[PDB]
Amino acid sequence: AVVGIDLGTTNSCVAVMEGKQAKVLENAEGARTTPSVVAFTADGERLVGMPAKRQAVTNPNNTFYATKRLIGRRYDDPEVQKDIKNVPFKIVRASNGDAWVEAHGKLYSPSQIGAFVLMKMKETAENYLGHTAKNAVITVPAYFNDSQRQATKDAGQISGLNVLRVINEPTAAALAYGLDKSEDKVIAVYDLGGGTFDISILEIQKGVFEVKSTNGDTFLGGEDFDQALLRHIVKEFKRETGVDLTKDNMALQRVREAAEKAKCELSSSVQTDINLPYLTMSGPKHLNMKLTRAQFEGIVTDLIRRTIAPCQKAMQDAEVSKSDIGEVILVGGMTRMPKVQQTVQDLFGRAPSKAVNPDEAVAIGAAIQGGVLA
Ligand code: NA
């Protein structure tokens, strides 16, 4: 049996083929997804996934996230010098000139961190299988190069996986939607993840996939919505109580967790409550706040627009037109947001397909591909 792994910028998922259907596997915490976050506590203990995530704000200098932005990359790559500006942790150039990460004097390569994430996936998958997992199919962005694909392939080996193949994410998702046997059909893939946004235009002819165009934004994702919502919450609190939280990470850690929760609520509801008791201390100050969908949409209107232009360029570079696109599938949890769904519809001129879970589709596709190989 061959494991399929979506090693994501922000979140990872693992699925395997059970019969004629792919089964997504859930970790020891009962979650079907795992944060691609790795951190080292002051003492030197290592944390991976949710544990690291729940410390990300209080321990910024030693928490590694969005490493996938650095994997397979040279240090002087504009994409790395840009990332340095947007992340608090330290990036240093290895002896190769490759982009590395440093924490507490110990430095790691992006492939090592990925390996830490892949190790837990491996663990997660093995619980299911019973035996040990040896063979994997891991996914990479269409825009990845050899250097990036090898480094991803190398990360799998460190964790003890033989990466039989590396397939493109957009292609993987298309597999999850059954487009494998399409005679002729042009597909647009709108992937808005926790950390990156991707638009990829695919054509399938007699079952052969071609990536015609690819565009997007490396620094626009779901986390950016959370932060914009956090600033709004923080700013609204100063007004009402006069307390400024910016300097208290322990509280900011809670707000982020709370901002992450409100966002999810507002894709199924138009209102939710931000309730954070004893956030600070003339006495305790409790954070009680009401957030509505229309408000949220307003707060992150600019995050959404920024998707509109890359998708237009994608079709241009692919010499296509809304009429030409036969289907549009959504990938990324941030695609659950209705306003994202609407912006996606009046962009490609059709209702987006939402049959497959937005953030398990790639893992599922990776499974399909792996079942084929076994
Ligand atoms: Na990703």
Curated annotation (Swiss-Prot):
EC number: 3.6.4.10
Binding positions for ADP per the UniProt entry: 10-11, 260, 263, 267, 333, 336
Stated regulation of activity: The chaperone activity is regulated by ATP-induced allosteric coupling of the nucleotide-binding (NBD) and substrate-binding (SBD) domains. ATP binding in the NBD leads to a conformational change in the NBD, which is transferred through the interdomain linker (IDL) to the substrate-binding domain (SBD). This elicits a reduced substrate affinity and a faster substrate exchange rate. Upon hydrolysis of ATP to ADP, the protein undergoes a conformational change that increases its affinity for substrate proteins.
Superkingdom, natural source: Eukaryota
Chain positions with Phosphothreonine modification: 34
Gene Ontology MF annotations: ATP binding; ATP hydrolysis activity; ATP-dependent protein folding chaperone; heat shock protein binding; protein folding chaperone; RNA binding; ubiquitin protein ligase binding; unfolded protein binding
Region (Nucleotide-binding domain (NBD)): 10-374
Disulphide bonds in the chain: none
GO cellular component: cytoplasm; extracellular exosome; focal adhesion; MIB complex; mitochondrial inner membrane; mitochondrial matrix; mitochondrial nucleoid; mitochondrion
Impact when changing residue 333 to S: In SIDBA4; uncertain significance
One GO biological process term: positive regulation of apoptotic process
Subcellular location, record wording: Mitochondrion; Nucleus, Nucleolus; Cytoplasm; Mitochondrion matrix
Post-translational modification N6-acetyllysine, affected residues: 23, 82, 85, 90, 153, 181, 235, 247
Reactions the enzyme catalyzes: ATP + H2O = ADP + phosphate + H(+)
Chain residue ranges for the region called Interaction with NFS1: 1-374
Modified residues (Phosphoserine): 353
Record keywords, A-Z: Acetylation, ATP-binding, Chaperone, Cytoplasm, Disease variant, Dwarfism, Hydrolase, Methylation, Mitochondrion, Nucleotide-binding, Nucleus, Phosphoprotein, Transit peptide
Residues bearing the modification N6-malonyllysine: 153
Family: Belongs to the heat shock protein 70 family.
Disorder: Anemia, sideroblastic, 4: A form of sideroblastic anemia, a bone marrow disorder defined by the presence of pathologic iron deposits in erythroblast mitochondria. Sideroblastic anemia is characterized by anemia of varying severity, hypochromic peripheral erythrocytes, systemic iron overload secondary to chronic ineffective erythropoiesis, and the presence of bone marrow ringed sideroblasts. Sideroblasts are characterized by iron-loaded mitochondria clustered around the nucleus. Even-plus syndrome: An autosomal recessive syndrome characterized by epiphyseal and vertebral dysplasia, prenatal-onset short stature, a distinct craniofacial phenotype with microtia, a flat facial profile with flat nose and triangular nares, cardiac malformations, and additional findings such as anal atresia, hypodontia, aplasia cutis, and others.
Quaternary structure, from the entry: Interacts strongly with the intermediate form of FXN and weakly with its mature form. Interacts with HSCB. Associates with the mitochondrial contact site and cristae organizing system (MICOS) complex, composed of at least MICOS10/MIC10, CHCHD3/MIC19, CHCHD6/MIC25, APOOL/MIC27, IMMT/MIC60, APOO/MIC23/MIC26 and QIL1/MIC13. This complex was also known under the names MINOS or MitOS complex. The MICOS complex associates with mitochondrial outer membrane proteins SAMM50, MTX1, MTX2 and DNAJC11, mitochondrial inner membrane protein TMEM11 and with HSPA9.
Role summary: Mitochondrial chaperone that plays a key role in mitochondrial protein import, folding, and assembly. Plays an essential role in the protein quality control system, the correct folding of proteins, the re-folding of misfolded proteins, and the targeting of proteins for subsequent degradation. These processes are achieved through cycles of ATP binding, ATP hydrolysis, and ADP release, mediated by co-chaperones. In mitochondria, it associates with the TIM (translocase of the inner membrane) protein complex to assist in the import and folding of mitochondrial proteins.
Entry remark concerning the domains of this protein: The N-terminal nucleotide binding domain (NBD) is responsible for binding and hydrolyzing ATP. The C-terminal substrate-binding domain (SBD) binds to the client/substrate proteins. The two domains are allosterically coupled so that, when ATP is bound to the NBD, the SBD binds relatively weakly to clients. When ADP is bound in the NBD, a conformational change enhances the affinity of the SBD for client proteins.
Name of the protein in its database record: Stress-70 protein, mitochondrial
Organism name: Homo sapiens (Human)
Whole-protein coverage range: 54 to 429 of 679
